[PDB]
Amino acid sequence: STALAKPQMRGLLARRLRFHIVGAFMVSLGFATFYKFAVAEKRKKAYADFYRNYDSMKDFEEMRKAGIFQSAK
Amino acid sequence: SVVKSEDYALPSYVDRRDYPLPDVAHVKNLSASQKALKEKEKASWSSLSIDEKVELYRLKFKESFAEMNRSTNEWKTVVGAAMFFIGFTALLLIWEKHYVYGPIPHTFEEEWVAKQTKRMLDMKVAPIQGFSAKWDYDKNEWKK
Amino acid sequence: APDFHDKYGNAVLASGATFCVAVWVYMATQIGIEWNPSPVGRVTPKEWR
Amino acid sequence: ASAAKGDHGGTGARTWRFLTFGLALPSVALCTLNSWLHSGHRERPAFIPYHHLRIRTKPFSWGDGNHTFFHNPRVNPLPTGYEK
Amino acid sequence: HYEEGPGKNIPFSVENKWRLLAMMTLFFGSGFAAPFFIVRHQLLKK
Amino acid sequence: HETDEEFDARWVTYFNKPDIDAWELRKGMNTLVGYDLVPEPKIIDAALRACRRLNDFASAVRILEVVKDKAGPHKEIYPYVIQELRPTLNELGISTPEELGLDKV
Amino acid sequence: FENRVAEKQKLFQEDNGLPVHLKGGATDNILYRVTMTLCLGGTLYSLYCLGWASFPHK
Amino acid sequence: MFINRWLFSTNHKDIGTLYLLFGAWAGMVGTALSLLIRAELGQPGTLLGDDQIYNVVVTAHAFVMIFFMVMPIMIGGFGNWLVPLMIGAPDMAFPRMNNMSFWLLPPSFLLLLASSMVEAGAGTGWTVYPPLAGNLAHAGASVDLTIFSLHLAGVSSILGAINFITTIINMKPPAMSQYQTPLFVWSVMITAVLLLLSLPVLAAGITMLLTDRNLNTTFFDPAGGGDPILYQHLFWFFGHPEVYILILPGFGMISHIVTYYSGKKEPFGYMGMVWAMMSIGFLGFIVWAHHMFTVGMDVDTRAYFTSATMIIAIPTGVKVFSWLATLHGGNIKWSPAMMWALGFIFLFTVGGLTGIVLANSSLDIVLHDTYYVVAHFHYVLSMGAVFAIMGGFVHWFPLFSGYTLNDTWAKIHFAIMFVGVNMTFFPQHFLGLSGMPRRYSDYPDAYTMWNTISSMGSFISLTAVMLMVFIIWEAFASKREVLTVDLTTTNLEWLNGCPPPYHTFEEPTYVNLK
Amino acid sequence: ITAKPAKTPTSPKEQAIGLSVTFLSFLLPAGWVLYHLDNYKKS
Amino acid sequence: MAYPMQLGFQDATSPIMEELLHFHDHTLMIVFLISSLVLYIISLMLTTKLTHTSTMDAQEVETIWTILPAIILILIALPSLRILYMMDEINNPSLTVKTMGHQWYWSYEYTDYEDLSFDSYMIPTSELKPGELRLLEVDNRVVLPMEMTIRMLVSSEDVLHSWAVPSLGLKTDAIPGRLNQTTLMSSRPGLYYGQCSEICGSNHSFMPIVLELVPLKYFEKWSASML
Numbered sequence A: 001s002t003a004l005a006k007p008q009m010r011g012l013l014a015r016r017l018r019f020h021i022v023g024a025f026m027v028s029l030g031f032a033t034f035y036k037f038a039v040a041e042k043r044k045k046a047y048a049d050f051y052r053n054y055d056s057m058k059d060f061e062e063m064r065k066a067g068i069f070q071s072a073k
Numbered sequence B: 001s002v003v004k005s006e007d008y009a010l011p012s013y014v015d016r017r018d019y020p021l022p023d024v025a026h027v028k029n030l031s032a033s034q035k036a037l038k039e040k041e042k043a044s045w046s047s048l049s050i051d052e053k054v055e056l057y058r059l060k061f062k063e064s065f066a067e068m069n070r071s072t073n074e075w076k077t078v079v080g081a082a083m084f085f086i087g088f089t090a091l092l093l094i095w096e097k098h099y100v101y102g103p104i105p106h107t108f109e110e111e112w113v114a115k116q117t118k119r120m121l122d123m124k125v126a127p128i129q130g131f132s133a134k135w136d137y138d139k140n141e142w143k144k
Numbered sequence C: 001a002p003d004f005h006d007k008y009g010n011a012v013l014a015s016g017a018t019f020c021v022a023v024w025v026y027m028a029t030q031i032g033i034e035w036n037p038s039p040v041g042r043v044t045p046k047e048w049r
Numbered sequence D: 001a002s003a004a005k006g007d008h009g010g011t012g013a014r015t016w017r018f019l020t021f022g023l024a025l026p027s028v029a030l031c032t033l034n035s036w037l038h039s040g041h042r043e044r045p046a047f048i049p050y051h052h053l054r055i056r057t058k059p060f061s062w063g064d065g066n067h068t069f070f071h072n073p074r075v076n077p078l079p080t081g082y083e084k
Numbered sequence E: 001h002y003e004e005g006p007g008k009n010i011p012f013s014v015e016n017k018w019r020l021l022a023m024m025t026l027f028f029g030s031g032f033a034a035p036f037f038i039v040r041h042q043l044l045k046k
Numbered sequence F: 001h002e003t004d005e006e007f008d009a010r011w012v013t014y015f016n017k018p019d020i021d022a023w024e025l026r027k028g029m030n031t032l033v034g035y036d037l038v039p040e041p042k043i044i045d046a047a048l049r050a051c052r053r054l055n056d057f058a059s060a061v062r063i064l065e066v067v068k069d070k071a072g073p074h075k076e077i078y079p080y081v082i083q084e085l086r087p088t089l090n091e092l093g094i095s096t097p098e099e100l101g102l103d104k105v
Numbered sequence G: 001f002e003n004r005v006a007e008k009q010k011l012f013q014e015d016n017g018l019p020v021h022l023k024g025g026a027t028d029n030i031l032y033r034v035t036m037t038l039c040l041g042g043t044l045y046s047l048y049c050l051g052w053a054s055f056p057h058k
Numbered sequence H: 001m002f003i004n005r006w007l008f009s010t011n012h013k014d015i016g017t018l019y020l021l022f023g024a025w026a027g028m029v030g031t032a033l034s035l036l037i038r039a040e041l042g043q044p045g046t047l048l049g050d051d052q053i054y055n056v057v058v059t060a061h062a063f064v065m066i067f068f069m070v071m072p073i074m075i076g077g078f079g080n081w082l083v084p085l086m087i088g089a090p091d092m093a094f095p096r097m098n099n100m101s102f103w104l105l106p107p108s109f110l111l112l113l114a115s116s117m118v119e120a121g122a123g124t125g126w127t128v129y130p131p132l133a134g135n136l137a138h139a140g141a142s143v144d145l146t147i148f149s150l151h152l153a154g155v156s157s158i159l160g161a162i163n164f165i166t167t168i169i170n171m172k173p174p175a176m177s178q179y180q181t182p183l184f185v186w187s188v189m190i191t192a193v194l195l196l197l198s199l200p201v202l203a204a205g206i207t208m209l210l211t212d213r214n215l216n217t218t219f220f221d222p223a224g225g226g227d228p229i230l231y232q233h234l235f236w237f238f239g240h241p242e243v244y245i246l247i248l249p250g251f252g253m254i255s256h257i258v259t260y261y262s263g264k265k266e267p268f269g270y271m272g273m274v275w276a277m278m279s280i281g282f283l284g285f286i287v288w289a290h291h292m293f294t295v296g297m298d299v300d301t302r303a304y305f306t307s308a309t310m311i312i313a314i315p316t317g318v319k320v321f322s323w324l325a326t327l328h329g330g331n332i333k334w335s336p337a338m339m340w341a342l343g344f345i346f347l348f349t350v351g352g353l354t355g356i357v358l359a360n361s362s363l364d365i366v367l368h369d370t371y372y373v374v375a376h377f378h379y380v381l382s383m384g385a386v387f388a389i390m391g392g393f394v395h396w397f398p399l400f401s402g403y404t405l406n407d408t409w410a411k412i413h414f415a416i417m418f419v420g421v422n423m424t425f426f427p428q429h430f431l432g433l434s435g436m437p438r439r440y441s442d443y444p445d446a447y448t449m450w451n452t453i454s455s456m457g458s459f460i461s462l463t464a465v466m467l468m469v470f471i472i473w474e475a476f477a478s479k480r481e482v483l484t485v486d487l488t489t490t491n492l493e494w495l496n497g498c499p500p501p502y503h504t505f506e507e508p509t510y511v512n513l514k
Numbered sequence I: 001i002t003a004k005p006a007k008t009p010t011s012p013k014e015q016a017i018g019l020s021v022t023f024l025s026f027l028l029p030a031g032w033v034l035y036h037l038d039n040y041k042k043s
Numbered sequence J: 001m002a003y004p005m006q007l008g009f010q011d012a013t014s015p016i017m018e019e020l021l022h023f024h025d026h027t028l029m030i031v032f033l034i035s036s037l038v039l040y041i042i043s044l045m046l047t048t049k050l051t052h053t054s055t056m057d058a059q060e061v062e063t064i065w066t067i068l069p070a071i072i073l074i075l076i077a078l079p080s081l082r083i084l085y086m087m088d089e090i091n092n093p094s095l096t097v098k099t100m101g102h103q104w105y106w107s108y109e110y111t112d113y114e115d116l117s118f119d120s121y122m123i124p125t126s127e128l129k130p131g132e133l134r135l136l137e138v139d140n141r142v143v144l145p146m147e148m149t150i151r152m153l154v155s156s157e158d159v160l161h162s163w164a165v166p167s168l169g170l171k172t173d174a175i176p177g178r179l180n181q182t183t184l185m186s187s188r189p190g191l192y193y194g195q196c197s198e199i200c201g202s203n204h205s206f207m208p209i210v211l212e213l214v215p216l217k218y219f220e221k222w223s224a225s226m227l
């Protein structure tokens, strides 16, 4: 009892591509933020936290008392 | 109807949704009634019956778009057979472990491994992230 | 007319998957393969010296 | 002795345009990058009044007679040393 | 005048599929088996 | 390269050639379906009337199928195009693929 | 010397179905059999030598 | 008639068939050697109890796969069958020399067998570096038999390169310029130029190794003023062009396959594809010392080789993106050859990207001579070459034979192989990052888990290879004869039917100039 | 592509035979060598 | 040393190795992103019935997909080369140690002051002491002072070998007739393991490297006791 509206008929493949390339880019940004957070920054913080108050002599004495060394008993 | 190897240099029929009007009719030879139908096609198509229209279509074309584009159950066969042959591979691995491989070295004995784990912790193997970092040296237990 | 995949696809998929999982699970757990996983959270360290 | 390229059959303008844009100008682009990375000024060296350098047997016919034609004060010392 | 056409432009016969199976089995089987027997040969020297 | 209207008009003119021959009908439709678009009703109309001048009912049905195919998952396009073509379909006695049962697999 | 190329052109274009490596006449066949005998015989001999060298006597 | 046709051939199709048969047989040998590698490594400890034999297996694995499987199949097999047909030529330029390129390969392979049977084998690595490969650490005939095997393979391919370049330059229709020839033809011409220039340098280097071993020269022996590192330069001056030789015909077949099963008349960006292959060919000659970043090289030289190596990603990326752009808008046919080609695009991209990691000489210090390199090149080379070969084989088997494969079986085969090669090689990245050396018969215990998985993967690919043989058997057993092939207007090699007659293009094509 | 029906159809039973023979041709000789490895090394 | 199921690099023992880890993180993120983007685009091209099969103009898009990869390569190359030239920069070692490769073991020479040298062999699996590591321990370790810049000079008295210690980021080939230099600085005491890294024959797998990093005064007394 009613007619159908004219839909978009031209450029449907290009329209699809454009939309999804933009989505792929936005995911790529979002991922890079996650990976810099979950991996690269995590690593920087782990190494900086480890060495911040690290006492290499205390580490050595622990190792020496555990018996691991040929040169130090 | 019947396609011959010796016809390879002639224009041929194909059903392809991107080549909707092939180079030849599907059926070239016409019976008496099919000849009469092609004559009737020269008059108003409103006077053709539904069956006559279908017959004209099936003289020109082999499969309709819906037929040529239909989906199939082939994926079930492919996936299932691939998994069968992957499963068969594990039989070969079982055979190899039983008849080819001997004992692995004594360093994989549970007590060796427990001692080796302590010595790795005593030398602080990977103490920033990889290994000893995961050990709680104050509570003498793996970090929870 | 139904083809091979219509007639047998469901059975091939179901049997192949069931067989594949069963025999890899058996291989992985029942025949003495030493996977050597991480001791972290698994091994109680024991005195060595 | 012919590089690793390989495209004849009747040489022509199309092939030489292809070389121009596909090899020659990319090379220029890459050397231009290389060059405009290793740009930036080096420490100029201590002045030493070596007698085989800053030669003056006759005054130059321009300026005060003691400056070379494309004298650069930052890197070209006079016979008596760098300028103020 | 050589034979032309499917099954004729090859140096092996495909006239009988079971003879063919034997031939292909010897052909690919011999290549796959050879390294195992070379290894055996080297192990049996010393 | 030109405006949509100019493109559609070239294609209408192409199919409207009174003495268009069978080869030209096929070349036209087989070229047209290469483009990123579903042909406007006015193009399809001209192609169907070419079919009529060439006494080829089957190719008219096929052309309606390829309109539906070019729409892909946009299920709204084909019913719209058929709607716009119904006066032509009625005038020329062209049954749709659906009316002929040719949409069954 | 005299140019006898025409004679050779007649000989090698004679419609006798012979391949070019035999089309000179009986001497071609002899040289072909000698070559092929040396190649196949030598190849068998090389396989014998591989057999010998494959095992310890060094 | 049999001997005339198959031992005295001057026919490009029959010689291509000989090459495909030879390469398939070599692939079995190469696969068996690969399974022995992975059996030795599949559990900690020793399996062969003889690491000299282990090293011999590794060495022969590589030589067989490179020189007797990939090059004969891609260049000798697909090149001889397809190149004359794709340019409408009646055969190759030198049809009788072409037959000698083929017949030099069984003797070359025989010499390599001989090397492994005499003494204790050539347990050298396929690089054959001195002094390990010299006459004190490898006394006796094994290494010399290897050198001679390479000499014969080298002559085979140099003469084949001469043949292909001449054929492609000289035997096209007079109207067809080089920019009207198909990409696979381009890919063969460029591969042939690389072979022509690179193999003579290898020949020079291995000849110097032969004379150091037997004539008391000292090219590579410091006692005489020689230098082991000079051999490495000569070897890799060949060996980097070689890895591009191994993939370029693959790129050419991938272009045709992707175009065809996308329903396209042409690949996207044809001149960019030509540019990219030429650029890859040229840059492939100026990067070799990235195989030598740990030998003691000056820092500026490391910086140059790092940078030059990375540039090759730019033309390669143009090819990858143009394959994607060829798919774009396609009427995609999900044929088994298409699956092979799609698997190629992805797995080649992974391996190329780990090659960019390795190009960074600072990181390569830690990754060099580890399984990270083994993982790089079994993605980009082993999977790259095998997937393009399988794609081409499945696609053109009906042309060569007149018969069709069973497509369902071919898709099952693809699926099994794709799981197998990824299970085999993906964990080797972890082994390399964590420091496991390559060319080892056994490993510290920590590395057990990934070696176990990798070896189980190798058996899945074994099952795929067995199934491949059955699938070829089933096709010749059932004899489904080809009828029609679509897209012949843009795939000239199909237009003479399946299989084409012994002589094709006796009357050349008509192409006008306009 | 299109093609004729098989001139010499290979039934499922025939395929099972061809597949079994093919697999055994690869597996039995290698399996024999590997099963006997210790025999070789000990010797 | 590596530990079971390890995915990435060994933890850094030296500042250069720490540099390499951050640079590897940077590069691998790019690798993941490009691989994922290609896989995704593949799937995007393959998931529509919409078609467009007529000729497509290429020159516009080829600009994007040459320039963006060129920018990415430059973003890798800049930190890559910085680390390269850092590693090269002069540091003034306090100690020089030589190592000579041999089939199949390493010898070490510490001849700045006294004639100290010894051989270093793999501990056979049958002689490991409980808790020791199969294929990695040696009888005589390379004792070295921690927190000091050390010049290592590497050569060979027979075939090629290669002296490697992954957690210090070190791999220097051992070439007869050649003396290759590398420098080593451990931030920590402990035991750091490596393995021969150029195929050298039948025991290539079995000639490992163990550095023992201790305070200078312990190194001095050890050195004296090894004369």
Ligand SMILES: CCCCCCCCCCCCCCCCCC(=O)OCC(COC(=O)CCCCCCCCCCCCCCCCC)OC(=O)CCCCCCCCCCCCCCCCC
Binding pocket: A016, B069, B070, B071, B072, B073, B074, B075, B076, B078, B079, B082, B083, H332, H333, H334, H339, H342, H343, H344, H346, H411, H414, H415, H416, H418, H419, J039, J042, J043, J046, J047, J048, J049
């Ligand atoms: C697709 C993923 C690609 C990623 C690939 C990259 C890497 C390369 C590998 C490249 C490999 C990709 C495999 C994709 C399967 C394609 C299915 C198919 O359409 O095949 C043919 C179809 C026939 O369909 C037709 O008769 C008409 C044409 C086909 C459909 C085209 C429609 C396309 C558009 C529709 C989607 C709309 C979505 C809209 C969305 C848009 C939003 C706007 O029939 C069938 O039953 C299927 C026949 C069997 C095929 C199964 C093969 C599986 C092999 C897997 C390998 C791993 C092994 C795991 C073995 C298991 C054991 C471990």
Ligand SMILES: CCCCCCCCCCCCCCCCCC(=O)OCC(COC(=O)CCCCCCCCCCCCCCCCC)OC(=O)CCCCCCCCCCCCCCCCC
Binding pocket: H350, H354, H422, H423, H426, H427, H429, H430, H433, J007, J008, J009, J028, J031, J032, J035, J036, J039
């Ligand atoms: C890429 C080829 C196909 C791959 C097939 C297998 C799929 C693998 C993943 C499929 C996903 C791909 C990436 C997996 C990385 C997983 C571990 C990791 O994060 O590793 C990071 C580093 C190590 O860094 C560190 O120090 C951090 C360690 C963090 C530890 C946290 C605990 C994690 C639990 C254990 C994980 C078990 C590992 C699985 C074991 C895997 C056994 C097979 O390792 C590495 O560099 C590995 C180097 C790989 C370089 C090649 C790039 C391939 C890209 C594929 C992308 C396509 C999209 C995926 C979609 C792919 C689908 C087609």
Ligand code: HEA
Binding pocket: H243, H244, H246, H247, H290, H291, H309, H310, H312, H313, H314, H316, H317, H318, H320, H348, H349, H350, H351, H352, H353, H354, H355, H356, H358, H359, H360, H364, H367, H368, H369, H373, H376, H377, H380, H381, H382, H384, H385, J034, J038, J068, J069, J070, J072, J073
């Ligand atoms: C098919 C064979 C093949 C191919 C094509 C390649 C391609 C490349 N290889 Fe690989 N390579 C080998 C086979 C191959 N390689 C073999 C056999 C060895 C070891 C030999 C031995 O020691 O035995 C090896 C070793 C090797 C090394 C030495 C590692 C070591 O021993 O320490 C290096 C170092 O730079 C290297 C780098 C590269 C690079 C940069 C490419 C580049 O050509 C890759 C370019 C491709 C891409 C980058 C992916 C597609 C690109 C895009 C999608 C664009 C966007 C990407 C970016 C911006 C990065 N290769």
Ligand SMILES: CCCCC/C=C\C/C=C\C/C=C\C/C=C\CCCC(=O)O[C@H](COC(=O)CCCCCCCCCCCCCCCCC)COP(=O)(O)OCCN
Binding pocket: D068, D069, D070, D071, D072, D076
């Ligand atoms: C930009 C790229 C280069 C372009 C050319 C630049 C100018 C050169 C003009 C002609 C060159 C020909 C003569 C070369 C003579 C010397 C000029 C050398 C090139 C030059 O320009 O040299 C400059 C000195 O010029 C000076 O003396 C002053 C030079 C001016 C006077 C020249 C007088 C001599 C002319 C003699 C001609 C004889 C010709 C005989 C031909 C006979 C044929 C049979 C270098 O400058 P600088 O500050 O010392 O150092 C730079 C430090 N920052």
Ligand SMILES: CCCCCC/C=C\CCCCCCCCCC(=O)O[C@H](COC(=O)CCCCCCCCCCCCCCC)COP(=O)(O)OC[C@@H](O)CO
Binding pocket: H093, H094, H095, H096, H097, H098, H148, H151, H152, H155, H158, H162, H199, H200, H203
């Ligand atoms: C360690 C010791 C190893 C020893 C290895 C020895 C290996 C091989 C044994 C060689 C036996 C050679 C027999 C003669 C071959 C002559 C080939 C020839 O002359 O080939 C010509 C083509 O190559 C041409 O021209 C130009 C090319 C002519 C090439 C001639 C042969 C070269 C063989 C050695 C090449 C080594 C390359 C060295 C550089 C690295 C003619 O081509 P055809 O197809 O025949 O005919 C075409 C007809 O139209 C002619 O009327």
Ligand SMILES: CCCCCCCCCCO[C@@H]1O[C@H](CO)[C@@H](O[C@H]2O[C@H](CO)[C@@H](O)[C@H](O)[C@H]2O)[C@H](O)[C@H]1O
Binding pocket: B092, B095, B096, B099, H035, H036, H039, I027, I028, I029, I030, I031, I032, I034, I035
């Ligand atoms: C890497 C490629 C190889 C992958 C794995 C191969 C899979 C196994 C295939 C079977 O191989 C057979 O296995 C038998 C054992 O099941 C062996 O018989 C041996 O064992 C029997 C039972 O103990 C005795 O009856 C026999 O005489 C004795 O030869 C037999 O020789 C060997 O052919």
Ligand SMILES: C[C@H](CCC(=O)O)[C@H]1CC[C@H]2[C@@H]3[C@H](O)C[C@@H]4C[C@H](O)CC[C@]4(C)[C@H]3C[C@H](O)[C@]12C
Binding pocket: G001, G002
């Ligand atoms: C016999 C021949 C005459 C030409 C022809 O045959 O008709 C002549 C012409 C050129 C002569 C040759 C040339 O003069 C060059 C050579 C000169 C030497 O002094 C004698 C041999 C030498 C090789 C000559 C031999 C012979 O007398 C030749 C070959």
Ligand SMILES: C[C@H](CCC(=O)O)[C@H]1CC[C@H]2[C@@H]3[C@H](O)C[C@@H]4C[C@H](O)CC[C@]4(C)[C@H]3C[C@H](O)[C@]12C
Binding pocket: H230, H233, H289, H300, H301, H304
């Ligand atoms: C590696 C090779 C020496 C081989 C040998 O030892 O026999 C040498 C010879 C010439 C060298 C090149 C030339 O010296 C020119 C360039 C000098 C730059 O400092 C490094 C890159 C540079 C492009 C060099 C790289 C490399 O060290 C080359 C190519």
Ligand SMILES: C[C@H](CCC(=O)O)[C@H]1CC[C@H]2[C@@H]3[C@H](O)C[C@@H]4C[C@H](O)CC[C@]4(C)[C@H]3C[C@H](O)[C@]12C
Binding pocket: D014, D017, D018, D021, D022, D023, D026, H271, H272, H275, H318, J059, J062, J063, J064, J066
């Ligand atoms: C000029 C040449 C051929 C054009 C033709 O005659 O058809 C084309 C083919 C491939 C082109 C190159 C490739 O498309 C890759 C690069 C793309 C950049 O957008 C410009 C430089 C770039 C390096 C291009 C330069 C030039 O337009 C090339 C070299």
Ligand code: CUA
Binding pocket: J101, J102, J104, J160, J161, J162, J196, J197, J198, J199, J200, J201, J203, J204, J205, J207
């Ligand atoms: Cu010493 Cu490997």
Ligand SMILES: [Cu+2]
Binding pocket: H239, H240, H243, H287, H288, H290, H291
């Ligand atoms: Cu390389």
Ligand SMILES: [Mg+2]
Binding pocket: H294, H368, H369, J162, J197, J198
């Ligand atoms: Mg090395």
Ligand code: NA
Binding pocket: H040, H041, H042, H043, H044, H045, H046, H047, H441, H442, H443
């Ligand atoms: Na082992």
